[PDB]
Amino acid sequence: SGAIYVGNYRVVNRHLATHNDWANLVWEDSSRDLLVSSTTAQGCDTIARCDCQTGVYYCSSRRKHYPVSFSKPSLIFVEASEYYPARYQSHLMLAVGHSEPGDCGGILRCQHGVVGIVSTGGNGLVGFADVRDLLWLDEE
Ligand SMILES: Cn1nc(C(N)=O)c2cc(F)ccc21
Numbered sequence: 001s002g003a004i005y006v007g008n009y010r011v012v013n014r015h016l017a018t019h020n021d022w023a024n025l026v027w028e029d030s031s032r033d034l035l036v037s038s039t040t041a042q043g044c045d046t047i048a049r050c051d052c053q054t055g056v057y058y059c060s061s062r063r064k065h066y067p068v069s070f071s072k073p074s075l076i077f078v079e080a081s082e083y084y085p086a087r088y089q090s091h092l093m094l095a096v097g098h099s100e101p102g103d104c105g106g107i108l109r110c111q112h113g114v115v116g117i118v119s120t121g122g123n124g125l126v127g128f129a130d131v132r133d134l135l136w137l138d139e140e
């Protein structure tokens with residue numbers, strides 16, 4: 001699990017989104033596994049506006065932050081799991097690194113801030129749902 005908190009917004013994997021998230025929705029996309037919901041108290045997080053391919057992610061199935069090189073956000077085939085079938089997820093970034101389903105929500109950060117959250121992976125890969133193209137998060 002895990003979320004970002006850019007102001008009074010909560011950014012989560014679309015598949016871990018709660019009833020409250022859907023009952024206080026802002027925007028959502030199944031192909032990306034992203035959903036943003038409203039909050040009453042503000043958050044502690046800046047979103048990266050950049051093309052970095054280096055950063056650090058949190059991996060819950062190891063209790064560690066790992067430094068990684070990561071690919072640019074693209075359309076990637078990801079194998080089956082408890083939450084989705086074997087499909088293409090868009091705006092996915094692979095790094096080489098350990099990941100399992102429950103690692104979803106872990107933050108990837110670079111010098112420019114929060115880059116994205118863990119969304120896909122397998123076979124020593126990890127895909128981060130990029131948030132960097134979502135320029136509207138910074139305001140309103
Ligand atoms: C980080 N991660 N997300 C998923 C997923 N959403 O299906 C996944 C599936 C895997 F077999 C291994 C790792 C994974």
Ligand SMILES: [Zn+2]
Binds near residue numbers: 048050051110111113
């Ligand atoms: Zn950056």
